Write a protein that holds these residues in place. Sequence first.
Motif, PDB file in Angstrom:
ATOM      1  N   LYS A  67      -2.925  -7.973  -1.549  1.00 54.84           N
ATOM      2  CA  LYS A  67      -3.961  -8.665  -2.006  1.00 54.84           C
ATOM      3  C   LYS A  67      -4.695  -8.547  -0.445  1.00 54.84           C
ATOM      4  O   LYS A  67      -3.978  -8.942   0.384  1.00 54.84           O
ATOM      5  CB  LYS A  67      -3.556  -9.982  -2.030  1.00 54.84           C
ATOM      6  CG  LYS A  67      -4.899 -10.721  -3.311  1.00 54.84           C
ATOM      7  CD  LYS A  67      -4.520 -12.057  -3.433  1.00 54.84           C
ATOM      8  CE  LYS A  67      -5.886 -12.973  -3.929  1.00 54.84           C
ATOM      9  N   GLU A  70      -3.508 -11.244   2.421  1.00 53.48           N
ATOM     10  CA  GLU A  70      -2.172 -11.620   2.095  1.00 53.48           C
ATOM     11  C   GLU A  70      -1.109 -10.711   2.997  1.00 53.48           C
ATOM     12  O   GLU A  70      -1.047  -9.585   2.396  1.00 53.48           O
ATOM     13  CB  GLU A  70      -2.029 -11.976   0.675  1.00 53.48           C
ATOM     14  CG  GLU A  70      -0.492 -12.535   0.157  1.00 53.48           C
ATOM     15  CD  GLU A  70      -0.424 -12.085  -1.303  1.00 53.48           C
ATOM     16  OE1 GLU A  70       0.417 -11.543  -1.728  1.00 53.48           O
ATOM     17  OE2 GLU A  70      -1.031 -13.279  -1.705  1.00 53.48           O
ATOM     18  N   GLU A  71      -0.151 -11.118   3.602  1.00 55.05           N
ATOM     19  CA  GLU A  71       0.933 -10.184   4.337  1.00 55.05           C
ATOM     20  C   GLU A  71       1.820  -9.703   3.435  1.00 55.05           C
ATOM     21  O   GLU A  71       2.202 -10.461   2.472  1.00 55.05           O
ATOM     22  CB  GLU A  71       1.299 -11.174   5.387  1.00 55.05           C
ATOM     23  CG  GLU A  71       2.525 -10.664   6.196  1.00 55.05           C
ATOM     24  CD  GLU A  71       3.014 -11.149   7.402  1.00 55.05           C
ATOM     25  OE1 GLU A  71       1.917 -11.563   8.243  1.00 55.05           O
ATOM     26  OE2 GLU A  71       3.948 -11.124   7.910  1.00 55.05           O
TER      27      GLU A  71
END
Length: 138
Positions: A67, A70-71
């Motif tokens: 996403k 997001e990591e």
Amino acid sequence: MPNFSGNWKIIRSENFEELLKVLGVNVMLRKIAVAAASKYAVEIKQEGDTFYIKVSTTVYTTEINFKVGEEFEEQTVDGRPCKSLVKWESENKMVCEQKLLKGEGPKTSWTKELTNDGELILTMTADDVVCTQVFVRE
Ligand SMILES: *C/C(=C/c1ccc(O)cc1)C(=O)OC
């Protein structure tokens, strides 16, 4: 509606060998990897800012899910695990910054862009070296 989603096939590959050199791959494996690169195919599924991507050659296939914002965990081009974070830089271009899980090494990143002419451009960077790969729809 058209987005990054699709089945893509490589048509051009600039500086791939030089990139592998920077990543410390030996000459014989680089040459094999260049030859293997001309069968790179990419399958993308995109909804909103969620991405599923499968990159494959003749003998190997890898899948990522992310996403934007997001990591996530993935590998570098030379298969060392890393933490990744993707951000948009425009309507159809995204940029991923990577950090090694263990170790030290070259600073690696990648970008994907959908152009006006319906091409997908991947750039992959290692230190000073930028590899560009151009794909078209199957
Ligand atoms: C999308 C993508 C594809 C890719 C292409 C070539 C190689 O060698 C690995 C992976 C990517 O984000 O890779 C950095």
